[PDB]
Design an enzyme around this catalytic site. Structure first.
Site, PDB file in Angstrom:
ATOM      1  N   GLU B  41       0.820  -1.222   0.000  1.00 47.96           N
ATOM      2  CA  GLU B  41       0.000   0.000   0.000  1.00 47.96           C
ATOM      3  C   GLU B  41       0.847   1.264   0.000  1.00 47.96           C
ATOM      4  O   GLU B  41       1.978   1.242   0.478  1.00 47.96           O
ATOM      5  CB  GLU B  41      -1.023  -0.024   1.151  1.00 47.96           C
ATOM      6  CG  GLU B  41      -1.986  -1.198   1.100  1.00 47.96           C
ATOM      7  CD  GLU B  41      -2.850  -1.356  -0.146  1.00 47.96           C
ATOM      8  OE1 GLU B  41      -3.203  -2.510  -0.474  1.00 47.96           O
ATOM      9  OE2 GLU B  41      -3.185  -0.335  -0.786  1.00 47.96           O
ATOM     10  N   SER B 347     -40.440 -50.909 -20.687  1.00 47.10           N
ATOM     11  CA  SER B 347     -40.893 -52.218 -20.178  1.00 47.10           C
ATOM     12  C   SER B 347     -40.260 -52.620 -18.825  1.00 47.10           C
ATOM     13  O   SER B 347     -40.756 -53.533 -18.174  1.00 47.10           O
ATOM     14  CB  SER B 347     -40.683 -53.300 -21.225  1.00 47.10           C
ATOM     15  OG  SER B 347     -39.308 -53.398 -21.553  1.00 47.10           O
TER      16      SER B 347
END
Lengths: 599, 596
Positions: B41, B347
């Site tokens: 920073e 089936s």
């Protein structure tokens, strides 16, 4: 265990909630809540099976917005306990575990409802809810009632400085710590600073005139009270008075004396004639701001300033931040102009450059040349378009003579000046590599200007601003203790790290005495020095000044740089804020000037 | 402590890494790493003071991709310890705390690099690094080396079922829990199932012909090896052979014997002429699949099936999931068809309806009419366009006679039938209130069909499929123990499963299905089963069991299209079931159904 913020005088000023989990006993969970989860998904292959596994996760499931577990979600989204949630709200929460950001009610309320309604539809088909319960819940709006978990209503700029800085440097996990942060903020000075900036900006604002009601024919409920201003709806306009409906439901009368100041704003350089009737000022349906006197027996018409301002005060011996005000009022925005408001210092920079000339051998009495000057294609002019010829260095600084500053810059060198500007605390990439820097063209923060001026107050040292005195964990263990660099170590007794010297003691002292001469050749004190500052077109008003125990920098200007007005050059608006603050902050303290004997 | 997945024999099969934190002592942190955070920073107002406050957060800072603290970030992004990182890598990590998604080097490489280079520039300005160190660092590429933290290479569908289900119901915290999930999965049976599905889908795929290369003129690095197939890029095509580049950089040759099978696919019913030259099969730049020998000496041209399949096997006494295969291969398709593949059973559903006819008093020998029938505007036809007339109920079931099924539905009633279907998991909204349910039109999952067939194997009870036997915390303390519903408690307090079918009906249907598998289709006489087919052979199913294991297999295309004219009667699904059952039941005694 929220992050807590204290002043240097042990006052708790702010609390910041982070990740939340409130465990509950599984059997204390309403049956409809468990059913909302059981209906949240089409299938389970782990009924009884999902119910038992849910018990292992119910208190920890991430539900968005820092909520871990159902009770934290009920608290965060609705300010409710789990038993107070409606079916619609339980279905909303049950819909979040899968995607707590895609189905979130805050970021995506439209998508959140779609997920809620689907779970509600599935609760109905599984026979968990009745058709009447279903119809009521699906028609129910989001009904969000989110409690504030960022409590900061005493000295808001000081509270927010801690939260914002911790999050910027350490991320959101910094808030989850539950730490107690004991700041350097002096609560008495902070309160003085807040009032001084509010008063100062209103004084500027009022002389620049009335700008009209902030709104017309809008509901009174949409407005908020702040800065001791109360929104009101004009209901009747008479010849010399007006009636207004207040948020408390009462109707108040503003008499002539409460509004007669309201000459209309035309531009920064012009106001209209004094108003002759109440109808020129306000109209029925206008939304205005009123302020009461001490006992609420009389109400006056006020205005929130459009201009902004800030104040930063530090101890020059160790950089401790004593008071900080980032704008007119924290309600406007969280922006802190002392820490983030990049502006040009203009003539406020001159003491930094003139100190380098003192370092290089010159004295406050050295004769300097205020004469026309041209460098390549650049012809800097003095603000007044006049030239004083040979004048003492101290007079050139008092008068902020641009041609002198440029000649001094030519003499000392651009790179040596940029380096000294960085030593004072200015930012390398914000300092141009040209002669305009003598005129204060670098971009700076007020806190950097305060660091720089501390150098004159402390005898030539670089201190570093700091706002943390100590940190304790939630259990009272001290886990951080400030170890600042001190200009004067013996001065603490009235420690370990010694600040770096950046100016000869003689240069620092010569400048401090020039700045005291400047202030005294315009508070009942004789230990203050200071410099006014202005930028081109009066886009900024600055004042930077100090005694041996406190350095304060004030600034006034519009956020979108615009003229303050022709009569506003020379730091005029900033000076009263500094005077009010310094006079009250220093009241009852002995004289504290430069130290010539104590090492 | 990752989420761990175990099979029923307590062998570790999968590990899922969640949130990671590797705490380090502050003195062990390289100074350049601390300096990268100090340079992160422009201004610090707490870089002298930041250095001490940093010690409080350095092991906790969220750094994206589940990394908490610097050592977790060094591992997650670079597969390194903190002292192995370069200055450029330390600056990359230091740029993350402020906005770990905005600066994430995976999601935003340009922004992450801009952030990294700005920090490197500040480290230079601040004097933390030299000009030489700076120039070296800025020129360095991102160089991510991310280790996989999800280990699932033994029985992938089983590992993924645990992870996917836990995240679906409980979110990402499920992984962070560090729980040890002891599954019902039988390791041996899971291995058998994976191989049976792979082989069965390849047998179908091969009959249907060569469908050309997987891709053409595509980067080889975009392909993955799986199911003993290796992606390769054709580099040279000769008269009867071809050369191909492997992912390890080697070049192999495929001789004629390894590609001669490549008859081209025309449609589901037609294959073209057998190839006489390699140019008819492959082209240079084709991405093909190769399979090696039993040790590695020769390579053959193979094909990854387009057709899909699944297998689900459960213990009918309690619903424990013993083996699960969600598709050809997890690394081809992660989708689990056993649990999410909604298909029509055709089936395969018939034994349920016919068992309800038995419940009403009919027997396997009751004469039923296979003859044209109309119900309002609906005229159901027999798939083969033939009508047998008066035949025994068991023969109508064996031969899957649609008109008989419809007549039996008229006798049983729609609502009784729907109730039985719902009784074994079938989703209500997924079962129509009409006569098409006699034909196997509800949408079903294979796992629901397994639950259904367990009803015959267990004597007529409803069991619930489950895959978790127990859960232990990261320390070994039992936090969950399955309490399933049991069909037969003495066969193991215990929960009793609900009866959903008469005992005699479940028993007689089990014997019909045993008659079907023994006389109309493994050296065992404890098996019953039914083939399943849908209209236009869009699905092939086989559902069958013994008294201890119920298995359902399915084969079909994900985008429903015909399997082919010769693919009726569950033909593709039967060998998968036979192969699995024969091997899974090997060395177990006879286990059949009980009449009560």
């Amino acid at each position: 265990k929220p992050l807590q913020v204290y002043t240097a005088d042990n006052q708790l000023i702010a609390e910041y909630g982070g990740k939340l989990s409130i465990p509950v006993e599984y059997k204390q969970i309403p049956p409809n809540f468990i059913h909302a989860f059981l209906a949240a998904e089409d299938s389970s292959f782990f009924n009884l099976s999902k119910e038992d596994i849910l018990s292992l996760y119910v208190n920890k499931i991430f539900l968005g917005k820092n909520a871990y577990g159902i009770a934290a979600a009920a608290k965060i989204y609705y300010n409710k306990s789990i038993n107070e949630l409606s079916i619609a709200q339980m279905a909303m929460i049950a819909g979040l575990p899968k995607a707590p950001s895609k189905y979130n009610p805050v970021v995506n309320p439209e998508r959140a409802l779609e997920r809620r309604n689907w779970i509600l539809g599935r609760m109905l088909q599984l026979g968990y809810i009745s058709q009447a319960e279903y119809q009521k819940a699906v028609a129910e709006p989001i009904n969000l009632n989110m409690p504030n978990r960022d409590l900061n209503n005493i000295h808001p700029y000081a509270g927010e400085m801690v939260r914002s800085e911790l999050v910027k440097h350490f991320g959101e996990q910094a808030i989850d710590s539950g730490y107690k942060v004991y700041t350097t903020i002096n609560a008495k000075r902070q309160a003085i600073a807040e009032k001084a900036v509010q008063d100062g900006l209103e004084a500027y604002d009022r002389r620049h005139g009335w700008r009209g009601a902030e709104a017309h024919d809008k509901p009174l409920s949409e407005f908020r009270a702040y800065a001791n201003t109360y929104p009101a709806q004009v209901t009747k306009v008479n010849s010399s008075s007006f009636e207004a409906l207040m948020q408390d439901g009462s109707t108040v009368t503003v008499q002539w004396s409460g509004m007669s100041w309201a000459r209309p704003y035309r531009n920064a350089n012009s106001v209209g004639a004094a108003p002759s009737r109440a109808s020129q000022i306000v109209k029925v349906k206008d939304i205005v701001r009123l302020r009461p006197n001490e006992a609420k027996t009389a109400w006056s018409l006020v205005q929130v300033p459009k201009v902004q301002g800030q104040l930063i005060a530090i101890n020059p011996n160790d950089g401790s931040i004593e008071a900080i005000v980032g704008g007119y009022n924290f309600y406007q925005s969280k922006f802190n102009r002392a820490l983030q408001g990049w502006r040009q210092p203009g003539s406020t920079i001159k003491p930094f450059l003139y100190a380098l000339a003192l370092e290089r051998g010159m004295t406050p009495y050295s004769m300097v040349n205020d004469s026309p000057i041209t460098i390549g294609k650049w012809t800097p002019k003095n603000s007044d378009g006049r030239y004083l010829g040979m004048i003492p260095l101290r007079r050139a600084l008092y008068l902020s003579r641009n041609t002198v500053s440029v000649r001094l810059l030519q003499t000392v060198g651009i790179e040596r000046t940029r380096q000294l500007f960085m030593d004072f605390g200015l930012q390398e990439d914000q300092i141009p590599r040209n002669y305009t820097i003598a005129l204060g063209t670098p971009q700076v923060l007020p806190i950097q200007m305060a660091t720089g001026y501390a150098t004159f107050a402390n005898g030539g040292y670089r201190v570093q601003p700091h706002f943390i005195q100590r940190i304790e964990d939630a259990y009272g263990k001290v886990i951080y203790e400030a170890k600042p660099e001190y200009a004067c170590i013996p001065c603490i007794n009235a420690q370990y790290r010694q600040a770096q010297r950046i100016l000869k003691s003689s240069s620092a002292y010569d400048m401090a005495n020039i700045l005291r001469d400047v202030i005294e050749h315009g508070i009942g004190r004789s230990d203050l020095g200071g410099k006014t500052g202005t930028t081109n077109d009066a886009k900024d008003a600055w004042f930077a000044g100090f005694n041996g125990k406190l350095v304060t920098v004030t600034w006034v200007g519009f956020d979108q740089p615009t003229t303050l007005g022709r009569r506003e050059y020379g730091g005029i608006a900033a000076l009263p804020i500094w005077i009010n603050f310094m006079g009250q902050a220093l009241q009852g303290t002995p004289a504290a000037w430069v130290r010539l004997e104590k090492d």
